[PDB]
Amino acid sequence: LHFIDQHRAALIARVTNVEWLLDALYGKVLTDEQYQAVRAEPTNPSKMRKLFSFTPAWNWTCKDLLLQALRESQSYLVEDLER
Amino acid sequence: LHFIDQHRAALIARVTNVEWLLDALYGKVLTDEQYQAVRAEPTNPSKMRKLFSFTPAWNWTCKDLLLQALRESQSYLVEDLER
Amino acid sequence: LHFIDQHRAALIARVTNVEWLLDALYGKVLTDEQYQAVRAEPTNPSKMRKLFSFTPAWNWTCKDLLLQALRESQSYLVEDLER
Amino acid sequence: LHFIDQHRAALIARVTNVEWLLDALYGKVLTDEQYQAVRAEPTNPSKMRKLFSFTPAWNWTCKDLLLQALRESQSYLVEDLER
Amino acid sequence: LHFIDQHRAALIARVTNVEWLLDALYGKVLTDEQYQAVRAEPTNPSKMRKLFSFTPAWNWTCKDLLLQALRESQSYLVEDLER
Amino acid sequence: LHFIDQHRAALIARVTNVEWLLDALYGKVLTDEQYQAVRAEPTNPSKMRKLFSFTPAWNWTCKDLLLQALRESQSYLVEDLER
Amino acid sequence: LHFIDQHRAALIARVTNVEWLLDALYGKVLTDEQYQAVRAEPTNPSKMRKLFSFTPAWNWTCKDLLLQALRESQSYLVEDLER
Amino acid sequence: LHFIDQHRAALIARVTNVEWLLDALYGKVLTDEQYQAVRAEPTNPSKMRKLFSFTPAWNWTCKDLLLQALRESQSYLVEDLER
Amino acid sequence: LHFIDQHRAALIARVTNVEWLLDALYGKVLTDEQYQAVRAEPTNPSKMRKLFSFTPAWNWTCKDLLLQALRESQSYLVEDLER
Amino acid sequence: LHFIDQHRAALIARVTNVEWLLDALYGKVLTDEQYQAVRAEPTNPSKMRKLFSFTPAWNWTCKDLLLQALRESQSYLVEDLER
Amino acid sequence: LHFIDQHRAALIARVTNVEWLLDALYGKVLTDEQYQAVRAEPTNPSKMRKLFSFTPAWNWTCKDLLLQALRESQSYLVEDLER
Amino acid sequence: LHFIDQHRAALIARVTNVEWLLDALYGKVLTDEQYQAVRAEPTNPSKMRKLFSFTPAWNWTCKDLLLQALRESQSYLVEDLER
Which terminus of chain H is more exposed, N or C, with fewer CB under 10 A? Predict the structure, then answer.
């Protein structure tokens, strides 16, 4: 949404389930080379940064898909930042 | 509580009942992949470190849940660090 | 099939007989170094990810072989995802 | 097309898959010295500028080829700027 | 062959056994500094790009050797692109 | 402040948390192209130089924001140079 | 505007986003030969002087366009010099 | 102290209790991202190098804290280098 | 010998007793940091590659030592490649 | 030789081991400022042109030295252009 | 001093820490445009020549400051040329 | 010594223990920014080239120290090139 880009610096630090979001987004948005490129950089925030590297090329129609994925996996930190 | 993050270095070394706390937190907070990921690393404190890897994504409504679980299982070490 | 790549995210989580599939595919498709490389990463889905790392190099003639192996081992989760 | 030169300032900023366009266009249009020359300038838009340096030497028959490449790789940002 | 330069963009993406080709080509063609330089860049296609950087310095008498090595390791993807 | 430009040569050498300051300053002052341009130049002070390249374009109303960010992350080196 | 020529010596020194202004003014005002000619002279103010070399061939109808570009990119240094 | 920087090359090789010092220094000096960044690099001295990467930003008031932690854990190698 | 560098690609794959050769070479040739660095990378050939990383710095006087160690441990694969 | 100046246009494009030729020629012919000056211009042929800038100051007695260096490193592209 | 202009040709070739001398002299003597202008010309001595372009506009009261900077950074090449 | 500059091209290729030489030379000769700058460029000889970039700034009194370090760590390649 605009919630993703609005709360960018907070979602960099408190998300700990990248490995599942990658499988949720595979095929639909992220190509394979980017999927392999994200699986590196052991520092966990770096996976988030490298993931947000492909955010500027997204329209309003798929950031919503990622927000649904976050609402299926966590659904608590989403509510934590919403409140 | 704030007691959990306040007394981290003491709770890493002196908690010896991970195998039950994992069952207390299952379904409610911990997903299945993280649950399988904790059951490794034979060094007993390392399971505690892997558990605290998921602490930053916790709100005030579930750290209390974990302290309740510790007051049901141990209830003396909780009192030992409280005093 | 195209069913293997179509239901990838579901097959990552619910297949629990990797140690036999590896023996089914040995000699025919997987070389020895890859076979030794898969037997690591205690987190059970990670073996599945390491297995799908070698999938892009598969044609229509061997993915069918893997679906045959799954129909010999599980044959219920295959039936569970087909329905 | 004329869409490439019409939306230049938008395509400079929102394209994040240059490393694949180079291989799609290799041999057909871009010589090798240009291919090695693009793989520099870490600032990602700078690869786009260095690529548009070779646009004036293109006819109507190959800018269409590049639009096909974008419709095969992204096909969403293309649709985002079309609408 | 000329098959190597003919199917460059396809061979960038679908080859997953670089770690063995390196040992096949060592001593005969590739010097040691290039051998150490290839063992980097975790993105798997980048190893392929850095490898094809040394392709222009090859005559007709050694690309045949590399195709033989590819026919000894995979022997299916060679057949997959041949058909 | 005037403290930022007053102690420039000391702050070039002893700051080790650039990757977080960028996320604190993102959206508000630094555009995205500069953000991508800073994540280069492995020599750690060079990130500081490239960051101070955009300092002359700052008024009194945002250097205060950067000093607040330094007082939230480090809060000791700020205190170390103040004393 | 007349603000541009009124504050010439201040806008020579404190503008750090030439690389975007060029893309804002491209096609509308600046021809391509000047666009390539400005991208030289590593000293950043020299790009500004070379840009103001083309100010005399501008009417009241396009300096306004450039001030709009500065109000979209920076919008703070403009406000800093206005006050 | 000055003893930490004076005997740097000796403390790189003979300290084998990083996993505990990290918990001793957590919250007080090391932020979370650096704590996650140290827990990598299987080569045991590399954790020491990555830890000393954050040493130049320390005043006299916390290097003493680290020497106290070393005197509580080891208390023999400190005495070994002192004598 | 020259047999070590001559049969490199065969010795990468068929030696399965690294943990003993390391003890044979300790103190005499390998320093301790390299010894710790080799005991990683679970894929068994990777220990061989990391071991041959230190081969170019060997004279004729110690590669013979390694061949004697292999003739004490294996003495069949040595004979298998000799014949 | 006269082969160097005779096959200049072929040796500009297909030589990919400049970084070693520099060390082969160091001390004997190239001064230090030229040695540092060649290590720039990421485009690989540009190092070749900057290298041939110093060819006119060479007699018949050192172009032979460079041909010897090329026959020691590559010895196949030399053979490829000889035939 | 007069030592700077007396040993100019020796200080052109053997100084390897320009990037710090610039920060030592910044604000006091060097303006910002000269600071940006020196940071070019990859050939390391060229930064030294461009630096000595501004020596003629210096009195006896600041060449002493620059010699102090050299005695704080190197203090050996100063000592090497003094002896 | 003069042995260091005489056998430069041989010491570029056959030394594999840079990570220890850096700690031997730290504080005494190499400043910290150069120390951080050397720990890059994954190609093992490139660390050596970046190291010899600072060699011209060494007198007869410290190259001896570096040869002592080489005789303490390796003491075999030193003897190998001496003979």
Answer: C
